[PDB]
Structure formats: C-alpha cells, structure tokens
Amino acid sequence: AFTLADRVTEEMLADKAALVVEVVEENYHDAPIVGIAVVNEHGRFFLRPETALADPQFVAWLGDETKKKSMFDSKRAAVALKWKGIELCGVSFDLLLAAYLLDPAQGVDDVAAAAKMKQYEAVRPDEAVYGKGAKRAVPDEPVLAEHLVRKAAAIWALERPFLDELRRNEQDRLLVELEQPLSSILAEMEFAGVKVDTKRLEQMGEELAEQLRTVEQRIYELAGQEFNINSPKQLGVILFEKLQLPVLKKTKTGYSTSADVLEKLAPYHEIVENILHYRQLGKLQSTYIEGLLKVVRPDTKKVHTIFNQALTQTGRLSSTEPNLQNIPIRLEEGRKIRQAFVPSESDWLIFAADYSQIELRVLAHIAEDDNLMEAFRRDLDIHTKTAMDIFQVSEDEVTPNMRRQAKAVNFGIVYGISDYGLAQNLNISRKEAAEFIERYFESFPGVKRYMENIVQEAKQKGYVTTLLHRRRYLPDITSRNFNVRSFAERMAMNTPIQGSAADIIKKAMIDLNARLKEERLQARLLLQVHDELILEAPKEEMERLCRLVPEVMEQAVTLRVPLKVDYHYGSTWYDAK
DNA sequence: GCGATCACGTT
DNA sequence: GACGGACGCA
Ligand SMILES: [Mg+2]
Numbered sequence: 107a108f109t110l111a112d113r114v115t116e117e118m119l120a121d122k123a124a125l126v127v128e129v130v131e132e133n134y135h136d137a138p139i140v141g142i143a144v145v146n147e148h149g150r151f152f153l154r155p156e157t158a159l160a161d162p163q164f165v166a167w168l169g170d171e172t173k174k175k176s177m178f179d180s181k182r183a184a185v186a187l188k189w190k191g192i193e194l195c196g197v198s199f200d201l202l203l204a205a206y207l208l209d210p211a212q213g214v215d216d217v218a219a220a221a222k223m224k225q226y227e228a229v230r231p232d233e234a235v236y237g238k239g240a241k242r243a244v245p246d247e248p249v250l251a252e253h254l255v256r257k258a259a260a261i262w263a264l265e266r267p268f269l270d271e272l273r274r275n276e277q278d279r280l281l282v283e284l285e286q287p288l289s290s291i292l293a294e295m296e297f298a299g300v301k302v303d304t305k306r307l308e309q310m311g312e313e314l315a316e317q318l319r320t321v322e323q324r325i326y327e328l329a330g331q332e333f334n335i336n337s338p339k340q341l342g343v344i345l346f347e348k349l350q351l352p353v354l355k356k357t358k359t360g361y362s363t364s365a366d367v368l369e370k371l372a373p374y375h376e377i378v379e380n381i382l383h384y385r386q387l388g389k390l391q392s393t394y395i396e397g398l399l400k401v402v403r404p405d406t407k408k409v410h411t412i413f414n415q416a417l418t419q420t421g422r423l424s425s426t427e428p429n430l431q432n433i434p435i436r437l438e439e440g441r442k443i444r445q446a447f448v449p450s451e452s453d454w455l456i457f458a459a460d461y462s463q464i465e466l467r468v469l470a471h472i473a474e475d476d477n478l479m480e481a482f483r484r485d486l487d488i489h490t491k492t493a494m495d496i497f498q499v500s501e502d503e504v505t506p507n508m509r510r511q512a513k514a515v516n517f518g519i520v521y522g523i524s525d526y527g528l529a530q531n532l533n534i535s536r537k538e539a540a541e542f543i544e545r546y547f548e549s550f551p552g553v554k555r556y557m558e559n560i561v562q563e564a565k566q567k568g569y570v571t572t573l574l575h576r577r578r579y580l581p582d583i584t585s586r587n588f589n590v591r592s593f594a595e596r597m598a599m600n601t602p603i604q605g606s607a608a609d610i611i612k613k614a615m616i617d618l619n620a621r622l623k624e625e626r627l628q629a630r631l632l633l634q635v636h637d638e639l640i641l642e643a644p645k646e647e648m649e650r651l652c653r654l655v656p657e658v659m660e661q662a663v664t665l666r667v668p669l670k671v672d673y674h675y676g677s678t679w680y681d682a683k
Numbered sequence: 684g685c686g687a688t689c690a691c692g693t694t
Numbered sequence: 695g696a697c698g699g700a701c702g703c704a
Contacts, residue, residue, distance in 0.1 A: 239684075239685075240684060240685085336690095336699095336700060337689095337700085337701080338688085338689050338690070338700095339689090339701075357688085357689070358688080358689095359687090359688065359689080360689095362689085362690095363689085363690080364689085364690065364691085365690080365691075385690080385691080386691095388699095389690085389691060389692075389699080392699055392700080393691085393692075393698095393699055394692090396699090397699070414697095417696095417697080418694080418696085418697085419696090420694085422694075424694090424697070424698085425698095426697095426698070427698095428698095429692095429693080429697085429698055431692095431693060431694085431698095432691095432692050432693045432694095432697085432698060433692080433693085434691090434692055434693080435692095435693085440692085521694065522694090523695090524695060526695060527695070530695095588695090589695050590695090592695065593695065596695090604694080635693095636693090636694095
C-alpha cells in the first residue's frame with residue numbers, strides 16, 4: 107500500500123524519512139537514478155526521478171541537513187546526485203554501514219540481507235528484482251516502485267533494532283561519528299576524481315610494448331617454437347615436456363608455472379629468466395597501463411574510483427575501477443605508474459602524507475611492550491632494532507640479511523602470515539622460522555603476551571575489537587581443523603592491529619577534512635590507499651599543508667607511542683616523495 | 684555469456 | 695595456510 111505520486115507534496119518532505127534514491131548501474135558515477143521512494147510518518151511514496159529531481163521543494167529537502175534521512179548505501183545516492191548537481195544532506199542513518207559494523211562477515215549486499223539480520227523478510231533481494239549479468243535490467247514501473255517502497259519500508263522499520271544493537275556493542279558513535287561522516291568525505295573524493303596524464307600512460311605502454319616484443323622473440327627462439335606465453339598450459343608444455351625441466355610444484359590441472367617455481371628453474375635454462383621478465387612487463391602493460399586507461403573518464407580526464415566502505419573484515423577501505431591500492435609499491439617500474447596521477451588544475455600540486463609503521467606502533471600501544479614502545483619513543487629504525495635484539499648484536503654488526511630477516515618477522519606481524527608463511531618468505535624451514543619467532547618473543551615478551559591474550563579473548567567472547575570498537579567475530583577459533591583454526595588465530599591477533607590502524611586513518615581523514623574547511627584552504631582529499639592520504643592543492647598552499655597535514659594526522663588519536671607521518675609534495679603522485 | 688582456473692599485485 | 699587480467703563449453 108503506497109502512493110505512486112505524479113507530483114511532490116508537502117507530506118513527502120517531513121522532518122524524518124526513509125529515502126531510496128535507486129541507482130541500478132554497478133558503477134554509479136554519472137549513472138541514471140531509476141526511481142525514488144520516501145517513507146515517513148505521513149505515508150509511503152514512489153516518485154519518478156525526472157519529476158522529483160526537477161522539483162525545487164524536493165531538491166531543497168534533499169539538501170537540508172535538518173531534514174533527516176535513513177538510507178542504505180547513501181554514498182551511492184550522494185554521488186549519483188552530485189553528477190546531477192544536487193546535494194544530499196542530513197543522512198542520519200545508513201543501514202549498510204550499520205550492518206557492516208554489527209558483523210562485517212555477513213557480506214550485506216542489499217537491504218534484504220540487512221533485513222534478514224532482524225527477521226524482516228518483506229523485501230526482495232536486489233538480484234531477484236534486477237537479475238544478474240546479461241539479463242540484468244530495470245523492471246517495469248509497478249514492479250520497480252513496489253521494490254523501492256519495500257526497501258524504504260524496511261529501512262524505516264530496521265533503524266531502531268540496528269541502533270539498539272550498535273548501542274549494546276558500544277558501536278553507536280562508531281557509526282554516527284566515524285563511518286557516516288567518512289561516507290560523505292569519500293563521496294566528495296570520488297566525485298572530485300584524480301586527473302590522469304593519459305599521454306604519459308600511452309607513452310609507458312609503448313615502451314612496454316617494445317620491450318615485450320623483444321623478450322617474446324627471445325622466448326620463441328629459446329623454446330624453438332612460437333606459443334602463447336600468456337597461457338600457463340602452453341608454457342608448461344614447453345618447460346616441462348619440450349625442455350624437460352624438473353617439475354617442482356604441481357597444480358590441480360597440470361604443472362605450476364608460478365614465479366616462485368620459475369625462479370627455482372632459472373639456473374637450468376635461459377628461457378626462464380625471459381619468461382619472468384615477460385610476465386612482469388606483461389602485467390604492468392595489461393593490468394596497470396591498459397587497465398588504468400580503460401577507466402579514465404574521457405569527459406573529465408580523471409579516474410573516479412568507488413570506495414567500498416563495507417567490505418573488509420578489518421575495517422580498511424577497498425576500492426575499484428580503479429583500485430589504486432593495488433598498484434605495486436616497488437619502484438622497479440611498478441611505482442612509476444604513479445607518475446600518471448597529476449593535479450587537476452594548473453599551478454596545483456599533489457601533497458602526499460603517509461603514516462610510518464602505524465601498524466607496529468599500534469601493536470606497541472595495545473601490547474604495552476616495553477621494548478617496542480621504547481624503540482618507537484626513540485624513533486629507531488624498527489627493523490634494524492629488531493635485528494639487533496634477535497641476533498644480540500650491536501647496530502654496526504647488523505648485516506643487510508639480518509635486517510631483511512627481522513623485517514620479514516615484522517612484516518609477518520603486520521599482515522598476519524603464519525610461520526609457514528614466514529618460512530616461505532624467508533626461504534627457510536618451518537622449524538627455523540619457528541625458532542626465529544621464539545627469539546623475537548624473547549626480545550618482545552609483551553607482544554607474545556598480547557598474542558596469547560587476544561586469542562584467549564577471542565575464544566571467550568567470540569570476537570575481537572579495535573581501538574574504536576570495530577568487531578570481528580571468529581567462530582572458527584576453536585575449529586578442530588588445524589588450518590582453519592590457525593587462520594582464525596592469526597585474524598584474532600591481526601585484526602586489532604590492522605583494524606585499529608584503519609580506525610586511526612579514518613579519523614584522520616575526518617579531522618583533516620574539517621581542518622581544511624576551518625582554514626579555508628582549497629586543498630582537497632583525493633585518495634586514501636595503504637597508510638597514505640593523497641591531496642591536491644594550489645602550489646600557494648604547500649607550505650601551510652606541510653605543517654597542517656602531519657599535525658592533524660599525528661594528533662588523530664593519542665597512543666602510548668608517537669604517531670609518525672612522512673609527507674612530500676610534487677608535480678605527480680610519484681614525485682610527491 | 685558463464686564457470687573453472689591460473690597468475691600476480693595488494694591485504 | 696580474500697580482494698581485484700587472461701580455456702571449454704554452450
Ligand atoms: Mg606499514
């Protein structure tokens with residue numbers, strides 16, 4: 107029972123409403139709005155967007171921060187409206203973000219999935235209404251309107267139960283003061299986009315094409331035959347049947363040709379180093395050059411990423427189209443791809459600031475490890491210090507390989523890799539990897555106690571938490587399957603570290619955005635990837651940003667150790683180093 | 684077009 | 695020990 111409205115009425119513009127502004131295209135940048143639903147104290151309404159979005163009263167209502175709206179994935183609507191020149195304000199509850207906080211492992215894709223968390227089933231999944239893949243389509247208006255009204259009615263009914271559970275979890279401020287404000291900031295970042303030097307990218311592609319053509323010819327000569335080097339199956343036949351190289355590792359289907367396996371084969375045949383070079387050149391070309399050019403909008407000459415704020419179980423952001431976090435960080439030629447990301451206006455520059463070792467600093471804080479805290483209080487090189495402690499040697503006795511091994515132990519902590527993974531990364535035995543870890547724990551006994559205590563807490567409570575009260579449930583922590591249990595244990599250890607770093611970065615973004623407005627700077631946030639925040643600003647704002655940005659980031663939270671920020675500016679993202 | 688795989692960046 | 699370009703069927 108709802109009103110299919112042909113005009114906007116005052117009844118539709120109440121102080122509080124559930125609002126659905128439906129964008130069916132997966133990528134919502136400059137995408138159609140196919141329909142609108144409003145549920146409030148006065149009734150339930152379906153509005154056609156060509157009418158409502160042309161109505162000055164409805165547009166004023168949308169932009170009025172005192173008119174409160176409950177939505178699901180408000181950033182999607184906010185950005186689609188930005189492309190139409192319409193501001194969305196007053197979103198006081200986002201059911202997507204609420205469900206994400208309550209349990210990020212549920213994978214809540216749509217209103218129906220969130221509704222099922224509270225035994226509400228009077229709404230269909232989006233996939234059931236719009237179909238999948240090739241058959242995907244907007245249905246006729248009667249079907250569309252009922253769906254959008256059912257989604258709005260679900261939001262209207264679910265706000266209270268969700269807020270009640272968030273309050274019980276001490277997550278209500280996490281939603282209202284962190285994730286929801288961040289959603290608006292992300293919306294602005296996505297809409298602003300990042301300018302891309304497509305001429306430079308095409309230049310890079312041309313250079314890669316030349317080098318690829320030469321290595322490919324080298325491989326055919328060495329193989330005595332032409333084949334598709336990009337086919338693992340064809341390559342396996344050349345390597346393991348034609349050239350009779352050893353089979354050191356299998357796949358489920360045939361022989362593995364992974365880079366790990368190939369490096370082990372390099373001493374036996376000159377073709378192997380060439381295949382490795384082809385693979386590295388080819389992934390830069392196909393994935394990062396051509397992949398980037400594919401998602402540059404020809405109308406803006408910018409990339410307009412979509413952040414997924416409700417995906418990871420740590421609380422880190424993710425992004426797509428492009429995913430700029432997946433650009434390799436190793437200089438070689440991977441990092442140079444950042445040269446293609448330039449300021450959007452003449453006489454502007456890129457300003458980039460990154461937290462230095464925020465994850466290990468968070469660990470020092472949470473574990474209250476005296477040795478690790480003092481190391482950061484002295485602003486030591488943490489990998490050199492870790493090697494000094496593990497090997498019981500003075501700083502001048504730390505060899506490069508000692509530091510490399512200490513760094514791998516620290517990497518293992520930051521990313522939650524097992525002793526098998528440490529052994530894999532260091533190319534040592536599992537017993538030797540285990541012995542390394544015990545030596546580490548002798549030097550950092552507070553870290554060891556934390557690791558023991560957090561696994562026990564996960565077993566007792568069923569979940570672990572971050573500094574700002576994000577939760578991750580770990581039902582597998584007592585699995586009788588060793589691999590499943592071990593993974594759960596590593597996530598118990600790692601999520602309070604990685605997730606607290608994510609919390610701090612998100613708070614820094616909110617604080618930064620507010621400070622930039624308060625200072626009346628034109629500088630704007632563009633991207634957040636890894637532990638870095640990337641802005642662009644007039645060149646005349648750089649000196650001010652050199653003081654302001656690190657200060658805001660260092661002060662986002664107060665820990666038992668300082669937060670350290672590195673910062674640079676330049677004519678491209680790469681040169682902001 | 685869709686599903687199953689393989690590889691390689693990130694986490 | 696998830697998240698995001700390159701063989702058969704049908
Ligand atoms: Mg780091």
